[PDB]
Every structure is written in structure tokens, then in C-alpha cells.
Amino acid sequence: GFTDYKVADITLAAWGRRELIIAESEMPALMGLRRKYAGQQPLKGAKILGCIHMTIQTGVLIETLVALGAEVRWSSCNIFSTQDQAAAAIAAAGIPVFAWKGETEEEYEWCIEQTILKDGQPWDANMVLDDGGDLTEILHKKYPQMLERIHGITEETTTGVHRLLDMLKNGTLKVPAINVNDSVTKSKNDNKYGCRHSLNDAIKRGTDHLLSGKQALVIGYGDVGKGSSQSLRQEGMIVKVAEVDPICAMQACMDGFEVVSPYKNGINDGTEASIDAALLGKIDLIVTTTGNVNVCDANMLKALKKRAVVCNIGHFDNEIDTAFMRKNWAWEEVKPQVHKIHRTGKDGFDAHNDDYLILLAEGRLVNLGNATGHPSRIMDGSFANQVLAQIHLFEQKYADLPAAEKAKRLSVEVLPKKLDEEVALEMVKGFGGVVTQLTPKQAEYIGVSVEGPFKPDTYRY
Amino acid sequence: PAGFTDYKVADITLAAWGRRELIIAESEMPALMGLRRKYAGQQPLKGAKILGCIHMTIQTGVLIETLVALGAEVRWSSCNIFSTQDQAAAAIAAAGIPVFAWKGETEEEYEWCIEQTILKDGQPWDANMVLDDGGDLTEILHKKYPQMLERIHGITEETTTGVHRLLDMLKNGTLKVPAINVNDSVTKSKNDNKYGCRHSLNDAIKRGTDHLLSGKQALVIGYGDVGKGSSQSLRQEGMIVKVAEVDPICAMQACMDGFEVVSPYKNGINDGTEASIDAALLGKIDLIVTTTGNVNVCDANMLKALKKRAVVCNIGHFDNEIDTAFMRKNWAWEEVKPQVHKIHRTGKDGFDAHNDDYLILLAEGRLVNLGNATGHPSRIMDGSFANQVLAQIHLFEQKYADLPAAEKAKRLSVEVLPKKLDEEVALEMVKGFGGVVTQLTPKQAEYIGVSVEGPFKPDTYRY
Numbered sequence: 056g057f058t059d060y061k062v063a064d065i066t067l068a069a070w071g072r073r074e075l076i077i078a079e080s081e082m083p084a085l086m087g088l089r090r091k092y093a094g095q096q097p098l099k100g101a102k103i104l105g106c107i108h109m110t111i112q113t114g115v116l117i118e119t120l121v122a123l124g125a126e127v128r129w130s131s132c133n134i135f136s137t138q139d140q141a142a143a144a145i146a147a148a149g150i151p152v153f154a155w156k157g158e159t160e161e162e163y164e165w166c167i168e169q170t171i172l173k174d175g176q177p178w179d180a181n182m183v184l185d186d187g188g189d190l191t192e193i194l195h196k197k198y199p200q201m202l203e204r205i206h207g208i209t210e211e212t213t214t215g216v217h218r219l220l221d222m223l224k225n226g227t228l229k230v231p232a233i234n235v236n237d238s239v240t241k242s243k244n245d246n247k248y249g250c251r252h253s254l255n256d257a258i259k260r261g262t263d264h265l266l267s268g269k270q271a272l273v274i275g276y277g278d279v280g281k282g283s284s285q286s287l288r289q290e291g292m293i294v295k296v297a298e299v300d301p302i303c304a305m306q307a308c309m310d311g312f313e314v315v316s317p318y319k320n321g322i323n324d325g326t327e328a329s330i331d332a333a334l335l336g337k338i339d340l341i342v343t344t345t346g347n348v349n350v351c352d353a354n355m356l357k358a359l360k361k362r363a364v365v366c367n368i369g370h371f372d373n374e375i376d377t378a379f380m381r382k383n384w385a386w387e388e389v390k391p392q393v394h395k396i397h398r399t400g401k402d403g404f405d406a407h408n409d410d411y412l413i414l415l416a417e418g419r420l421v422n423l424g425n426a427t428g429h430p431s432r433i434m435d436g437s438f439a440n441q442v443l444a445q446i447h448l449f450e451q452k453y454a455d456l457p458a459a460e461k462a463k464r465l466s467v468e469v470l471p472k473k474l475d476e477e478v479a480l481e482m483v484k485g486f487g488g489v490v491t492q493l494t495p496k497q498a499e500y501i502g503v504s505v506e507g508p509f510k511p512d513t514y515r516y
Numbered sequence: 517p518a519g520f521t522d523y524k525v526a527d528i529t530l531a532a533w534g535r536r537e538l539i540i541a542e543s544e545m546p547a548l549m550g551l552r553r554k555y556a557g558q559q560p561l562k563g564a565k566i567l568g569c570i571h572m573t574i575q576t577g578v579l580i581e582t583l584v585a586l587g588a589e590v591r592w593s594s595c596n597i598f599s600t601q602d603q604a605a606a607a608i609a610a611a612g613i614p615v616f617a618w619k620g621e622t623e624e625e626y627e628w629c630i631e632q633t634i635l636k637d638g639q640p641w642d643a644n645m646v647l648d649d650g651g652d653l654t655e656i657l658h659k660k661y662p663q664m665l666e667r668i669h670g671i672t673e674e675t676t677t678g679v680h681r682l683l684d685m686l687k688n689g690t691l692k693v694p695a696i697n698v699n700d701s702v703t704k705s706k707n708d709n710k711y712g713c714r715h716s717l718n719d720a721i722k723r724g725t726d727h728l729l730s731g732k733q734a735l736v737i738g739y740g741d742v743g744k745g746s747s748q749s750l751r752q753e754g755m756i757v758k759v760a761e762v763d764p765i766c767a768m769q770a771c772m773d774g775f776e777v778v779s780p781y782k783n784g785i786n787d788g789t790e791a792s793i794d795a796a797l798l799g800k801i802d803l804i805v806t807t808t809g810n811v812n813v814c815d816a817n818m819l820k821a822l823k824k825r826a827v828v829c830n831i832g833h834f835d836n837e838i839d840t841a842f843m844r845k846n847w848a849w850e851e852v853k854p855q856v857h858k859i860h861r862t863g864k865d866g867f868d869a870h871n872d873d874y875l876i877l878l879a880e881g882r883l884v885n886l887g888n889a890t891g892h893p894s895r896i897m898d899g900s901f902a903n904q905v906l907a908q909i910h911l912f913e914q915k916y917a918d919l920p921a922a923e924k925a926k927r928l929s930v931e932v933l934p935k936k937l938d939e940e941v942a943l944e945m946v947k948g949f950g951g952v953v954t955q956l957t958p959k960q961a962e963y964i965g966v967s968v969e970g971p972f973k974p975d976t977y978r979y
């Protein structure tokens with residue numbers, strides 16, 4: 056008689072369980088943590104509010120936390136990223152989850168509130184796992200009393216970590232956090248290689264367009280932009296890259312990309328005349344990867360080649376001025392998460408009009424919106440870090456300190472390199488790779504221990 | 517964890533305390549923990565299923581958890597009724613590891629504990645490795661469960677007495693699986709057996725009696741590695757130490773080490789009569805310690821002749837070094853406290869509470885350092901147990917049980933670890949002290965005919 060959930064179709068649970076069993080074989084770091092810590096139950100007593108894409112991969116994470124003793128209440132951190140069969144499997148296992156593919160904004164907020172509230176009253180939560188900072192923001196803004204009992208936050212992604220550091224500098228952060236994003240086995244695995252796998256995957260599922268021989272513009276060349284550019288280049292696209300960071304621009308050049316700006320001489324003054332109309336007129340596909348605001352703006356959208364695809368793989372949809380397109384242009388749904396946007400007018404469209412753009416996932420995270428996000432074996436690294444971070448913060452029991460002691464432990468930290476390496480070793484073994492062991496004299500020669508850590512904390516990999 | 521009941525210990529609530537001491541012990545065992553860290557990634561014991569029978573101390577806890585960390589499953593018991601530290605056993609069971617051990621077992625409970633490791637859910641466990649200290653588990657397997665040895669890849673034997681039993685089986689063709697003699701690594705024998713007893717013999721006598729040792733007379737029976745370490749344990753406290761030996765080379769060492777070499781028997785001739793006892797000698801001895809691994813070296817006539825209120829103890833592996841059976845049959849036992857009895861020579865039935873004619877027996881004649889104290893310290897057992905881990909990996913990887921008969925015939929032996937591995941254990945022990953070993957120049961290594969990496973001595977070297 057379990058009813059504390061809300062999913063699209065509970066009967067998809069058996070299908071979801073089949074895929075969870077497969078995914079478990081693809082996630083050895085996470086399943087190794089489950090085996091190593093199951094008997095010790097290091098999360099016994101933890102009550103975790105979780106807000107992250109309700110995919111099959113997140114399901115393995117959820118059941119790993121539960122296997123270690125935790126109770127959880129879960130929601131997705133995006134309206135399009137849930138895999139309904141994963142949510143169904145988690146609900147059928149008796150775990151409160153509120154998540155389905157294609158939520159409205161109102162339903163998105165309701166789902167988070169259903170994790171926060173149990174039977175109309177605040178749940179006695181004491182841990183937070185977030186991806187992007189929406190749950191974190193709601194707790195600080197609307198439920199500050201609940202944070203008095205919460206031992207910490209473990210934050211998944213770059214945008215969320217940015218919001219956390221903003222609150223820390225403004226003195227508004229109420230509990231300590233661990234930056235899961237900046238582990239090497241997260242940032243340089245998930246953010247880069249994950250988008251390499253899943254960006255062309257989403258574009259093919261949404262459009263079935265040939266990419267070889269076509270022109271792409273990738274806005275940004277951080278980790279997500281690096282992986283995105285590779286996702287397209289390996290398919291044979293001619294890829295151009297835009298950046299505001301000269302060091303990232305240098306890497307793009309050395310990686311074999313032409314570096315261009317959508318604006319003449321890189322200067323974005325807000326006018327149509329600043330747009331490089333000749334450049335945008337040749338682009339078949341534009342992808343935003345920045346985590347910034349309005350990096351594919353209304354003047355760029357007006358100037359893009361007819362029938363160009365437009366998508367975003369950064370965390371929030373405001374990378375693209377989709378508001379401008381809702382106000383001025385007529386939307387034709389091809390299928391879910393795929394819209395033709397007719398630049399001929401707002402009121403109606405000719406079904407055979409040739410002047411349209413194709414928008415994927417209404418400008419929300421395209422890899423999760425139009426495909427299934429990152430594959431299990433990549434998320435294995437990110438989610439082993441999440442499990443380790445949850446254990447660390449829960450065992451430190453920040454909320455039980457006196458007021459004076461909380462002030463001294465309020466911080467945003469990363470996991471130590473030794474744990475990063477141990478996650479990486481399990482990932483390598485999952486590939487069948489064999490790591491060499493240093494001899495004692497070789498370890499002394501480079502000044503490390505035989506068991507690591509093998510690099511100083513300044514090393515960039 | 518939840519549902520785990522596959523153990524038997526004195527008091528599971530001691531586990532937190534045991535964990536605290538295991539965490540300290542890890543800081544004292546650099547060679548063993550270096551192996552745990554070195555081999556953790558490879559998991560060289562994955563699939564190993566180890567029957568283990570050795571004193572269930574804190575130090576054995578670090579060894580057990582190292583084996584598990586390297587991939588093994590284990591089922592464990594103590595090799596002596598009085599040697600278990602109950603907090604170590606508790607910590608191991610609380611970790612979900614099957615262990616049957618507590619301080620103060622009866623002889624029946626002892627045999628029950630070994631059988632609980634051998635059997636799982638009423639049937640022979642599918643074990644494939646044996647770690648033993650003294651040969652009791654090895655003897656039970658060969659005599660009672662011979663079919664289980666068809667699946668076991670080897671035995672790693674800890675101590676002198678157990679190795680002698682193995683070689684007797686090899687000589688008679690009754691040994692069914694190969695063994696590694698862990699005892700005769702130099703980082704075991706000339707560390708554990710000698711310096712271990714130097715630390716822990718006077719330790720156990722003080723805990724049991726709180727007797728001043730300085731200025732009093734001691735008789736140490738034997739001058740092997742344990743006898744050497746025991747004699748130093750007492751001499752360094754200021755005892756006047758006399759040594760008995762049947763081996764004239766060991767006797768020569770005693771003399772040169774500054775001890776008077778004497779015999780309990782006139783002219784060393786033990787004809788079993790009372791008249792052969794050097795009564796004047798034994799009448800001046802305040803403490804006698806057996807160290808031989810032999811039988812009845814402190815016999816009934818010696819016990820009858822000992823100075824009143826003398827302390828009697830054994831630090832060899834088995835209690836039959838002392839004729840305690842004679843004392844149980846003829847003399848009244850007064851328990852002072854656990855593992856400390858006054859043996860009243862006035863008769864069997866009852867005793868006067870203020871009688872002066874008694875002896876003090878420690879640990880009822882069982883290994884006194886472990887019975888009345890905690891045995892060897894962690895930093896010494898570090899060497900012995902690093903050897904144990906190396907010996908387990910080597911025999912498990914050789915996979916004797918899986919070889920054809922002709923390949924078994926070439927491997928059925930009792931061997932020691934290579935000197936190079938002995939040296940690598942020693943090196944970590946030295947670094948644990950802050951010692952700095954010098955590296956040979958190439959010219960120097962050529963001059964004495966060795967590699968810069970070692971081994972530095974021929975296999976004949978005695979150290």
C-alpha cells in the first residue's frame with residue numbers, strides 16, 4: 056500500500072528494473088561502494104532530499120544511498136530529463152519520487168515541494184543532494200528552519216557550485232557543501248566525455264539529421280564545450296568555436312577548430328549590425344555550452360541559416376533567447392521536445408514554409424531532453440563521488456554543533472585526491488585496464504607514495 | 517552488520533574499544549600495512565577462503581583485516597585457550613568476520629572453536645588456504661577432514677613447533693598440501709621469537725605477580741630464539757639468570773652472553789630419580805621459565821625441589837613443558853586471580869590460606885606472554901605477519917590443489933620465503949624506526965659481489 060510518489064506510469068517499473076540491473080553492471084565504482092559500505096551502514100539515519108535528473112543512472116545512485124542506510128525523497132532537476140521507466144522502478148521499490156518527462160514549470164516546483172513536505176509537514180530531512188541549486192535555493196528561501204537540521208549539501212554541477220559560492224560570499228549559505236563537480240572523475244569525465252557521448256546522440260534522436268559535412272557553431276569551450284565540439288567533430292561536422300576565455304580559445308585552436316565570434320570583432324553591443332550575418336548565415340547547428348545568459352541571442356537567431364538546428368546543453372534554458380522566439384515566432388511541434396520555429400510571424404504558419412529553425416528540448420538540456428543523458432559507465436564516476444560526499448558530510452554532523460562551531464566549519468570543499476584516484480581506479484578496471492604499480496625507488500624518485508596521491512593538488516590533468 | 521551471527525566471542529560490546537586499539541596497531545605495523553596498501557588494487561587473494569588458527573590478539577586483527585582487504589574470506593579461531601584478547605575478537609566479529617575465540621576457553625571449547633571455522637552451516641566449508649600457529653588446525657584437517665585437503669592450496673605455518681610437525685609429516689609422506697615455513701624468515705624468527713619474548717616475558721610476569729625481578733635468581737630452560745629473548749627479558753631487569761641447554765652451541769652462546777650454564781640434574785643426567793636433582797641449585801631459584809618446545813623440561817622432581825614461593829611459567833607453545841599434570845594430581849590449587857594460581861605442596865585436599873610452601877604457576881602453564889599479558893607488541897608482530905601475507909599470496913597463486921599429479925609432486929614441500937622478500941619486510945620495519953639504510957655504490961656492490969638491490973647475503977648466512 057505504497058502511495059507516496061508521483062510518476063507518469065507505474066507499470067513501466069519492470070522495464071525500469073531490467074535497465075537498472077544492466078546499468079549496475081556498467082557502474083563498478085558505485086557498485087563497489089555499495090558492496091564495501093553495505094554492512095557498515097554509514098548512512099543509517101540520513102534523510103536525503105535529492106534533486107537530480109531522474110534517469111536510470113540516478114536510480115542506481117538512489118538505491119546505493121538506500122543500501123547504505125539512507126531514507127530519501129527524490130525529484131528531478133529538469134522538466135524533460137526524467138526517464139519514466141526509471142522513476143517507475145524507484146516508486147515501485149517503495150521510494151518517494153516525484154518526477155516525469157515533460158513536467159510544466161508549476162509541476163516542477165510541486166515535485167520539489169513534495170520531497171520537502173511529508174503529509175503536508177516538513178520532512179525531518181538532514182542531508183541534501185542537488186544538481187543545479189534549485190532545491191538548495193528553495194530551502195534557503197522558503198524553508199530556512201529545515202536547514203537548522205541539515206548536515207550539508209552535495210552539489211553535482213558547475214552552475215550549482217557557482218550559486219553556492221555566491222551564497223558563501225554573501226554570508227547567506229546556512230550549511231556546508233561539497234563541490235562534487237570539481238573531482239577529476241566528475242568534471243573531466245562527466246562534463247567533457249559525457250557530452251561527447253550524448254550530444255550527437257540527442258541531435259540524431261530529435262532530427263535524424265546527417266551531421267557529416269555540415270557547419271556547427273559551439274558557444275563555449277569549457278569542459279562541456281570541449282566534449283560537445285568533439286561530439287560533433289567526430290561525426291565529421293565542420294566545427295567553429297566561440298569563447299570569451301582566451302585560454303579556452305587557445306585550446307580550441309590547438310585542437311583543430313576555427314575560433315569565431317557571432318559578433319563583429321567580438322563586440323556585442325546589442326544591435327543587429329554587430330552580428331556577423333555572413334558567418335551565422337552558414338551555420339547548420341548551434342549549441343550553447345556556457346552556463347551564462349543569452350549567449351545565443353535574438354539577433355543571432357534572426358541571422359541563422361534557414362532550417363538550422365538550435366540547442367543548449369548548459370544547465371539552464373536562458374542560454375538561448377527562447378523568450379524572444381515565444382513572443383515573435385510561431386511554434387510547430389514536430390514531436391515531443393522538437394519544435395520548428397517559423398520566423399515568418401507569430402500568428403500561424405505555412406506548413407511548407409522554408410524559413411524556420413529547429414529547436415530541441417525547448418532549449419533545455421538537450422542531451423537529457425532528447426536522449427538519455429550521459430551513459431551509466433560515465434555517471435559511475437560522478438555518482439561514486441556523490442556517495443562519498445554524502446557519507447563525509449553526514450558523518451561530520453555539522454547541524455549538531457553549537458552556534459560557535461558551525462561558523463568555523465561553514466565552507467564549500469572538494470573531496471581529497473586520494474578518493475578521486477580510488478574512484479578512477481575502479482573505472483579503469485571496468486574497462487579492463489591494468490594500472491602499473493611504482494617500485495619503491497620509482498616512488499622516491501618522483502616524491503610520491505606507492506599508493507598515491509600521485510599528483511599535487513595544483514595538477515590540472 | 518545486520519543478521520550476522522556467525523561468530524562466538526566473550527562480549528560483542530567490546531568491539532568499539534577493539535577498533536580503537538586496531539587503529540593504533542595499524543600505526544605500529546608499517547610492513548603489514550604497506551602490503552595492505554601495496555596489494556589493495558590487485559586483490560591478490562580474491563577467491564581465497566582461509567582457515568585461520570592463531571592467537572586472536574589485536575595484532576592478529578590487523579593481519580586478518582589485511583587478508584580480507586586483499587580479497588580473502590576467512591574463518592578464524594585462536595590457537596591457545598588463554599591468548600585471545602576479547603576486544604580484538606569483538607572488533608573482528610563486529611566487522612562481519614567469523615571468529616570463534618575468547619580468553620579462558622576450556623579444552624572442549626577450544627576444539628569446538630576450530631571446528632566452527634572448519635564447518636559452515638553443518639558442512640565442510642569450501643576452504644582453500646590454511647594459516648596455522650602450532651599445527652593444531654593442520655592436524656585436525658589431516659586426521660578428521662582429509663577430504664577437505666583435496667581443495668586446499670597450502671598452509672602457512674607461524675611457529676617453530678608447527679614447522680617441526682609439518683616436517684615430520686613430510687618425512688613420513690603424510691603431508692597432503694605444501695607449506696611455507698613462516699617461522700624461519702629472519703624478520704620472523706630473529707624478531708618475533710627473540711625480541712618478542714624479550715618485551716613480553718617480564719611484562720607477563722609483572723602483570724601476573726607484580727614481583728620485583730631485580731636481584732632474584734632465574735632459571736631459563738633453553739637458549740634457542742625464545743630462550744635467548746627470555747633470558748634478556750630477565751637479565752635486563754636485573755635478575756641473576758642461569759641457563760640450561762641440551763645444545764652445546766646454544767650453551768656456548770649463553771656463556772659468551774654472560775650467563776652461567778647449569779643443569780637441573782647432577783652432571784646433566786636426568787635418570788628420573790629424585791637423587792639426580794641438583795636440590796641445592798633448584799632450592800635457590802625464584803623463577804623458572806621453559807622455552808624449549810620439548811616435553812617435561814620442568815619435571816615433577818624439579819617442581820618438588822624448587823625454592824618455596826618460586827614462580828613457574830612456560831613461554832614455549834605447549835603447556836606440556838611443565839609437568840602440570842603432576843601438580844593437579846598431588847597439590848592443591850589456589851586461584852589468586854585469572855591465570856595466576858598458588859600451588860600448595862602440602863597436599864591435595866585443601867590448603868592453609870597462610871601456607872608458605874607453595875609455587876606460583878602462571879597461565880596454568882600455557883604461553884605466559886599471551887596468557888598473562890598481550891604477547892608480542894604490534895611493531896614486532898608486524899614482521900611475522902607481513903611474512904604471513906606474502907606466504908598466503910604465494911601459495912594461493914601457485915594453486916597446488918588445481919595442479920596435475922606430476923606437478924604436485926614437484927611442489928609438495930615445506931619452504932621459506934625468498935631472502936629478497938625477507939629483506940623487503942626488514943626494510944619497512946627499519947623505516948618505521950626512522951632508520952636510514954645506506955645504498956651501495958655500483959663499485960661497492962661489485963666489490964662484494966651483490967646487486968645494489970640485494971639480496972645482500974648468501975642463503976647460508978645466519979645473521
Ligand SMILES: NC(=O)c1ccc[n+]([C@@H]2O[C@H](COP(=O)([O-])OP(=O)(O)OC[C@H]3O[C@@H](n4cnc5c(N)ncnc54)[C@H](O)[C@@H]3O)[C@@H](O)[C@H]2O)c1
Binds near residue numbers: 245250298299368428
Ligand atoms: N548537459 C549536461 O549533461 C551537463 C554536464 C555538465 C555540466 N553541464 C552544465 O553546462 C554548463 C557548462 O559547464 P562547464 O563545466 O563546461 O563549465 P565551464 O566553466 O568549464 O565552461 C563554460 C565556458 O563558457 C565560456 N563562456 C562564457 N560566456 C560565454 C559567451 N558569452 N560566449 C562564449 N563562451 C562563453 C567560458 O569562458 C567557459 O570556458 C553549466 O551550466 C553546467 O552546469 C551540463
Ligand SMILES: NC(=O)c1ccc[n+]([C@@H]2O[C@H](COP(=O)([O-])OP(=O)(O)OC[C@H]3O[C@@H](n4cnc5c(N)ncnc54)[C@H](O)[C@@H]3O)[C@@H](O)[C@H]2O)c1
Binds near residue numbers: 737766
Ligand atoms: N610464546 C611465544 O610468544 C613464542 C614465540 C615464538 C616461538 N614460541 C615457541 O617456543 C618454543 C621454542 O621456540 P624457538 O624458536 O626458541 O625454538 P628453538 O629450536 O630455537 O629453541 C629451543 C631450544 O630448547 C633447547 N632444549 C630442548 N630440549 C631441552 C631440554 N630438555 N633442556 C634444555 N634445553 C632444551 C634446544 O636445544 C633449543 O636450542 C616453540 O614451542 C615455539 O613454537 C613461542
Ligand SMILES: Nc1ncnc2[nH]cnc12
Binds near residue numbers: 110111112427429434
Ligand atoms: N544520465 C544522467 N543521469 C543523471 N544526471 C545526468 N547528468 C548528465 N547525464 C545524466
Ligand SMILES: Nc1ncnc2[nH]cnc12
Binds near residue numbers: 897
Ligand atoms: N601478540 C601476538 N599476536 C599474535 N600472535 C602472537 N604470537 C606471539 N605474540 C603474539
Ligand SMILES: [K+]
Binds near residue numbers: 427
Ligand atoms: K543514459
Ligand SMILES: [K+]
Binds near residue numbers: 573891892893894
Ligand atoms: K600485544
